[PDB]
Design a protein around this ligand. Structure first.
Ligand SMILES: Nc1nc2c(ncn2[C@@H]2O[C@H](COP(=O)(O)OP(=O)(O)OP(=O)(O)O)[C@@H](O)[C@H]2O)c(=O)[nH]1
Ligand SMILES: [Mg+2]
Ligand SMILES: [Mg+2]
Lengths: 283, 86, 553, 38, 14, 29, 56, 360
RNA sequence: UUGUAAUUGGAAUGAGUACAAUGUAAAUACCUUAACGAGGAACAAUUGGAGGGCAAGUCUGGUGCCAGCAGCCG
RNA sequence: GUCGACGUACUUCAUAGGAUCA
């Protein structure tokens, strides 16, 4: 495991958390607890999720014999598996292996945190921060930008960590948008997955795949069933109908010849609306 | 040219220490804060807050020394050959 | 680089500035009186046979000077004149050389804020060789340059004819003074001061005979105000040098007795729309708030309870709720959040300016930025004052500098009226609140380098602090490496030392100078400036401690 | 007048309270630094 | 310690 | 009693001095 | 940049409103996650048959 | 000799004003006609607190207690603890220190103990979000009020620490001749020794009134329970309308009594905040006294503040009259050139006050 | 047979002062020159650097009496 | 905004080796 030891970057992290005195902080990856003491100092109370019992015990000994006892609370388990309490701000230096799930879980919390400061691998952080038209723009960028806004706080170098990792790191701020935009998560994710197989090809070429035709035709059959209209269920019955539907929507939206990597939020939303209009539901 | 903001080492216990001879000065040209040397704590008495000090190139990190205060040579004041005009 | 300086605020009024005070200081018999006569003849074409006290004279279209001859034999006069003198004509006897009064005066000026200093050499005709004359001029000039600044102008006067100096160099001196500019000094720009132009006793003669001469008097003082404006309301605390502290009983402005030609032309220009020498010694709510007779509730109704209640008064809950069923009537305050496209762009840029305009809303040097903020602020001062009415203006800002004013004081000592010499100046200086308070003053002090002897603890010393001159008993101390304040027996020979003494308080950073002897009888030959130093802190108490050793075997 | 050596500490009620708070706090989690049989 | 550096004080006559 | 108080008083004064000497030297460099 | 940002936000709001106008559930709909499979096991076929029978 | 005043009116202002000026004052005929005449217990304690934070001041109170003589000294501050009588909350004693704290020889570090809220005095959130932000505009960069423990009436038990690190020569000259565009509405709803359900119900009530608006409404829920929650059940709300443009803030506050409906108080406080915005031009009525005082003690300069005609009430006049009596400064009011509204520009020439207590 | 002189002897001299003359358009100065002008020759050469030593003195740290900082203050 | 890239300017880490002796 890798442990940070530069106090300045940790101090900057806790400062930029901007934790109000009436805030409860979800601190993932307690480790030894260098961040935890300072979070406790300027917080109402802190809930800590630790995977290793020994590190949690060491944190308990470290904090023991201070004013900040009643504030700290330690949960033992795997962060995803646990069902978490309400938390206002999330400050984490967790192992990077759980970077991508973590983010989305914070997005899908019943009451999402207003602010979180997350440490991510530099490549992963840039992908989170990528804007439309960038090289690293990807499904993660579009999805997270739908459900939140991510900004860059610091670039943390190799030397700070001991033992050195083979990749640099960075610290970013994640802001979940309240109210949550009223678009179904599943439909958005399906459209993006179909369109991002090769982000530098035409969206049409993205749809030309045969399995995409099969999935979309089955979806159209299911939808027609939902509206009580009868459907034959033959394998290729409406391949020719769904094909024309897709061609017409792609032509009229004018997104047929535009690469997915250069498409912004509004372009994808227009495409979703058109596909719905003509009757195709992705997920 | 600079403005003497404060005499940082004025409260240091050990006399004639390197810290005692350092003053935090505002460069009037750009407003950047810098640190300057005084030849000795005896000269530090002449320097007080909010006077003009002429700085010249020289506790590592301090690269300037005071040569004139209030338009009068600091050496001259130390040698008791002039009075600081106020 | 040399153009840069510490930013400062100059309080000199934009219009009708006061006459500049010119102090003619020099040893006895050096030629002070004749120089004043020679100058005034040039600027006004009239000769004053006798001069006593300040003399105000016109020097140009929009420039005036007040000449004052410092009594050569008084050190006190040298001190207070040094504080208010805008320009000093330093008279030096060339044949004899420099003198204590010259050296003493310069040192006082250096510590109390340097004014413009101009060296004037006299009695050069007494020299019998041209070679020795040139050598003597060279030596005096270089020594003079050490005191004031290198390259300082030094004028040379040969002899006296008909009680007047030669015309040519008087022209040179007159032109030099005319184009002179003056620096902004900390003290003169932060306190109001006035040099008395004429002296008058207003006490009723009946009271003088019924109770006797010993009765205290009522005195009126006329003169030009300088520095910061003086508040119009009576009761202001001022200090008259060598007299004491008094409260302004009455104050009212008078017509300018020596108007500059530019001023007269404008006044005569006003007449259309509808003397060079002066030496006498020789229901608008705003109003409703400020009539105390009307009760505040009476005031409110005519044009339409206590601060213990922090929460402001509110109408009943139900009436307020009905008043605010709708959000209208405040929507301007809140941010909003083919032809209509322009209307949207109208709205949007307005929103942008509110949100981000200020982060965006250049001068080359940081020095200029400081000066601009001061100058911008001074412009704001002027604009509203021009909107302001003259009477309401005097009520807000008070009497601005340049105003010729009558000030009346009660309970003045009678000896001031009786033992009144027009030669000795009367200097009135305003006092800030801290100047009134008395207490312990902590200062960094060093023996003057030219003073022969070191000072002693519990040894009387006359300190010149602010407008005031007074004697105290200082205690010289050391920090003992910043552990404790240890009493010293004598001041260090060639370095500073902390000094504590009881006296009137002052703002920190206020310079001062010390003298052990002020009487002429005990002057002797040595230098009379004893100590120089800067006040470091003001307090009510101090913990000086002395070393005590117990001895046994 | 200067002291040469540290003064003898005095057992005031606050000192006893702090020390007994320590003792109780140790025994709560059974944190005993005692000798163990080899 | 409170009286060490004090000169004034409240004079209650009640 | 006076001995105990002085030692406590000197202790805090020294600690504050050293902490200030720490802050000042960090700033200058 | 601010004005284009605000215009984009208005377009987004209109599109999202029109999206709420027309919405359905996604439980029965096959996810696009299956795009890589291209072949289904007998267990998956039985699950599909059961789901379709439940639909009718 | 002494500038004289009558009654208990504006006691804190007069004493504070005297302390800044350095001019001795006399206050006489304090509740002469009441059954219990003279000086109240809490208002004694304020004089004790003034004595603690200064040196050289002389305070005399008459034998009958209806007359007070005050000869001010220098402001020195320091670290101290003050026990606040139950008759008044901490906000009663903290509020005058906001005037005095930035102009001290040493940093103010005062620990207050007692009731932390009331129906008549400034609350903690009013001070934290409503009053100090005005000082920060005047040049008090560093100031904080730390709420270590909340104490509701009648048993109180709260604890608050006031720290003012910023020491300045004098307030900056203010120039505010526009109506600040207030961008968002924030606030804090707090409760002690009770269920969280109340706090949520209050945020609902405030939100109902404020839902029709065109800005953000985000009200913090600060539920206090346990040892630090004080000794009595209590609950209150403070709503602050914030102008991020020039960092101006408008606030209203109130607390609830036993048996009162949480929704109604939320509706009332939200309604009261709405009253304040309408009646205000640049600063709120509850903030105006600080602004006017600070401008009087600025550099010898005129600061311009826009004030609505509704703010010119009984309190404003008596405040100005007290200022003239002590400082002789005159507040001038002129109409604004606009016709849409009726606001006035308050121009106040500073006296050139400076911090001489601070060591250099 | 080396170093140190507020020791001591009578000889020399110009910086400066100055009759005069020369110099110059008239002057100043130079070169000349009557007469004054040297013992602390006080007729009082400077600008930088390096190294000490001293206390009933001050600060700081500790394998006692020590070491560092430094010391116009005893 | 303690934003990214570039340009510019500085800081920093990598120095001991052979022979004899104890
Ligand atoms: N020969 C000559 N005599 C001068 C010169 N300057 C002044 N005097 C004379 O010195 C005497 C004093 O001149 P004043 O004008 O009175 O100088 P003062 O400063 O007023 O002298 P007091 O006021 O009496 O102290 C007069 O007789 C003047 O003739 C000069 O340059 N040459
Ligand atoms: Mg005369
Ligand atoms: Mg020559």
């Amino acid at each position: 495991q890798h442990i940070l030891k530069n106090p300045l970057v940790a101090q900057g992290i806790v400062d930029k958390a901007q934790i109000r005195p009436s805030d409860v902080v979800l601190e993932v990856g307690p480790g030894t607890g260098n961040l935890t003491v300072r979070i406790l100092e300027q917080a109402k109370n802190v809930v800590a999720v630790e995977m290793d019992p020994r590190m949690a015990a060491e944190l308990t000994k470290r904090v023991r014999g201070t004013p900040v006892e009643k504030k700290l609370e330690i949960m033992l388990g795997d962060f995803m598996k646990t069902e978490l309490p309400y938390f206002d701000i999330c400050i984490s230096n967790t192992p990077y292996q759980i970077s991508s799930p973590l983010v989305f879980k914070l997005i899908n919390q019943p009451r999402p945190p207003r602010v979180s400061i997350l440490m991510f691998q530099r490549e992963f952080a840039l992908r989170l921060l990528a804007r439309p038209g960038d090289s690293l723009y990807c499904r993660l960028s579009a999805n997270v930008q739908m459900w939140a806004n991510v900004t860059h706080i610091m670039k943390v170098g190799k030397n700070n960590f001991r033992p050195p990792p083979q990749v640099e790191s960075s610290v970013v701020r994640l802001e979940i948008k309240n109210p949550r935009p009223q678009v179904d998560y599943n439909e958005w994710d399906g459209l993006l997955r179909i369109v991002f197989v090769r982000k530098n090809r035409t969206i049409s070429a993205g749809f030309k795949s045969t399995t995409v035709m099969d999935i979309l035709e089955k979806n159209y059959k299911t939808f027609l069933a939902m509206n009580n209209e009868m459907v034959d269920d033959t394998k290729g019955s409406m391949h020719d109908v769904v094909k024309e539907k897709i061609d017409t929507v792609l032509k009229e939206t004018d997104l047929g010849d535009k690469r997915a990597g250069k498409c912004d939020q509004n372009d994808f939303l227009r495409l979703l609306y058109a596909f719905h209009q003509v009757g195709i539901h992705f997920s | 040219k600079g403005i003497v903001l404060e005499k940082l080492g004025i409260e240091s216990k050990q006399p004639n220490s390197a810290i005692r001879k350092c003053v935090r000065v505002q460069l009037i040209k750009n407003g950047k804060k810098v640190t300057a040397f005084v030849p000795n704590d005896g000269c530090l008495n002449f320097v007080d807050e909010n006077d003009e000090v002429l700085l010249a190139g020289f506790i590592p990190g301090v690269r300037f020394k005071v040569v004139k205060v209030s338009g009068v040579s600091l050496l001259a004041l130390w040698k008791e050959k002039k009075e600081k005009p106020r | 680089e040399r153009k840069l300086h510490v930013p400062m605020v100059d309080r000199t009024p934009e219009d009708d500035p006061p006459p500049f005070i010119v102090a003619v200081v020099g040893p006895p018999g050096t030629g002070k009186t004749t120089l004043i006569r020679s100058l005034v003849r040039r600027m006004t074409k009239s000769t004053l046979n006798d001069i006593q006290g300040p003399i105000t004279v016109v020097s140009g279209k929009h420039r005036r000077l007040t000449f004052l001859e410092c009594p050569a034999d008084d050190l006190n006069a040298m001190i207070d004149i040094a504080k208010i003198a805008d320009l000093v004509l330093l008279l030096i006897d060339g044949n004899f050389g420099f003198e204590m009064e010259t050296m003493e005066f310069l040192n006082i000026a250096q510590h109390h804020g340097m004014p413009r200093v101009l060296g004037v050499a006299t009695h050069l005709d007494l020299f019998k060789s041209q070679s020795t004359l040139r050598a003597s001029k060279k030596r005096l000039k270089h020594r003079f340059w050490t005191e004031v600044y290198q390259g300082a102008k030094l004028f040379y006067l040969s002899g006296v004819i008909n009680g007047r100096y030669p015309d040519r160099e008087i022209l040179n001196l007159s032109r030099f003074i005319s184009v002179m500019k003056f620096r902004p000094l900390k003290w003169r720009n932060e306190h109001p001061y006035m040099l008395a132009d004429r002296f008058t006793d207003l006490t009723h003669p009946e009271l003088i005979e019924t109770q006797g001469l010993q009765i205290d008097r009522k005195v009126a003082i006329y003169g030009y105000l300088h520095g910061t404006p003086l508040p119009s309301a009576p009761g202001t605390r001022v200090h008259i040098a060598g007299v004491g502290d008094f409260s302004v009983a009455q104050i009212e402005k008078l017509p300018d007795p020596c108007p500059t030609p530019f001023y007269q032309q404008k006044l005569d220009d006003f007449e259309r729309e509808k003397k060079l020498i002066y030496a006498p010694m020789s229901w608008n709510i705003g109003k409703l708030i400020y009539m105390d007779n009307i009760s505040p509730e009476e005031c409110i109704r005519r044009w339409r309870v206590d601060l213990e209640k922090f929460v402001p008064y509110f109408d009943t809950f139900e009436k307020l709720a009905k008043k605010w069923k709708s959000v209208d009537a405040i929507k301007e305050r809140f941010l909003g959040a083919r032809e209509m496209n322009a209307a949207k762009k109208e709205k949007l840029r307005a929103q942008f300016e509110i949100e981000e305009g200020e982060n965006f809303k250049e001068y080359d040097t940081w020095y200029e930025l400081q000066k601009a903020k001061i100058s911008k602020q001074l412009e704001i001062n002027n604009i509203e004052y021009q909107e302001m009415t003259p009477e309401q203006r005097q009520r807000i800002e008070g009497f601005k500098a340049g105003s010729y004013v009558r000030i009346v004081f009660e309970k003045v000592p009678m000896e001031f009226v009786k033992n009144f010499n027009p030669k000795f100046p009367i200097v009135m200086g305003g006092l800030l609140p801290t100047e009134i308070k008395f207490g312990i003053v902590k200062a960094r002090l060093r023996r003057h380098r030219w003073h022969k002897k070191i000072l002693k603890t519990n040894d009387p010393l006359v300190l010149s602090l602010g407008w005031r001159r007074f004697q105290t008993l200082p205690i010289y101390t050391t920090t003992d490496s910043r552990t404790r304040t240890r009493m010293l027996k004598y001041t260090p020979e060639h370095t500073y030392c902390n000094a504590a003494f009881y006296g009137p308080l002052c703002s920190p950073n206020t310079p001062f100078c010390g003298v052990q002897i002020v009487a002429n009888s005990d002057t002797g030959n040595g230098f009379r400036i004893a100590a120089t130093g800067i006040v470091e802190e003001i307090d009510v108490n101090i913990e000086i401690v002395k070393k005590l050793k117990l001895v046994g075997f | 007048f200067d002291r040469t050596a540290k003064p003898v500490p005095v057992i005031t009620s606050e000192v006893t309270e702090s020390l007994e708070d320590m003792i109780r706090r140790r025994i709560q989690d059974s944190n005993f630094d005692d000798l163990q049989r080899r | 310690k409170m009286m060490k550096n004090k000169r004034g004080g409240v004079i209650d006559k009640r | 009693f006076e001995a105990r108080q002085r030692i406590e008083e000197k202790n805090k004064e020294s600690s504050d001095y050293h902490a200030k000497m720490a802050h000042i030297v960090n700033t200058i460099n | 940049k601010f004005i284009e940002h605000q215009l984009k936000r208005e377009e987004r709001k209109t599109i999202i409103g029109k999206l709420q106008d027309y919405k359905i559930d996604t439980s029965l709909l096959t996810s696009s996650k299956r795009l890589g499979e291209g072949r289904q096991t007998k267990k998956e076929e039985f699950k599909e048959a059961l789901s379709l029978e439940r639909q009718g | 000799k002494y500038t004289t005043f009558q009654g208990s009116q504006n006691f804190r202002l007069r004493i504070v004003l005297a302390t800044l000026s350095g001019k001795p004052i006399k206050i006489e005929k304090i509740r002469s006609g009441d059954l219990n005449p003279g000086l109240k217990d809490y208002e004694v304690s304020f004089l004790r607190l003034i004595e603690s934070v200064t040196n050289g001041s002389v305070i005399e109170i008459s034998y009958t207690g209806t007359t007070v003589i005050y000869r001010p000294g220098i402001i020195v501050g320091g670290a101290s603890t003050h026990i606040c009588p139950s008759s008044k909350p901490v906000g009663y004693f903290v509020e005058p220190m906001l005037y005095l704290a930035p102009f001290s020889k040493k940093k103010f570090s005062i620990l207050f103990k007692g009731i932390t809220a009331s129906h008549n005095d400034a609350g903690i959130e009013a001070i934290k979000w409503g009053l100090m932000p005005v000082m920060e505009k005047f040049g008090v960069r560093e100031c904080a009020l730390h709420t270590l423990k909340r104490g509701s009436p009648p048993l109180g038990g709260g604890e608050v620490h006031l720290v003012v690190d910023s020491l300045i020569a004098q307030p900056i000259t203010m120039h505010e001749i526009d109506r600040p565009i207030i961008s968002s509405i924030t606030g804090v709803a707090y409760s002690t020794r009770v269920s969280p359900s109340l706090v949520n119900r209050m945020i609902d009530g405030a939100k109902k009134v404020l839902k029709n608006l065109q800005c953000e409404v985000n009200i913090t829920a600060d539920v206090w329970r346990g040892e630090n929650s004080g000794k009595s059940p209590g609950w209150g709300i403070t709503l602050v309308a914030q102008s991020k443009q020039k960092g101006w803030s408008y606030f209203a506050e109130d607390i609830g009594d036993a048996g009162s409906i949480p929704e109604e108080l939320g509706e009332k406080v939200a309604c009261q905040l709405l009253e304040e915005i309408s009646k205000s031009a640049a600063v709120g009525r509850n903030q105006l006294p600080l602004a006017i005082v600070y401008m009087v003690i600025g550099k010898e300069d005129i600061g311009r503040l826009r004030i609505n005609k509704e703010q010119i009430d009984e309190r404003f006049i008596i405040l100005l009259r007290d200022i003239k009596k002590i400082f002789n400064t005159e507040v001038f009011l002129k109409p604004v050139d606009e016709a849409d509204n009726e606001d006035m520009i308050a121009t106040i020439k500073g006296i050139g006050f400076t911090n001489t207590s601070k060591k250099i």
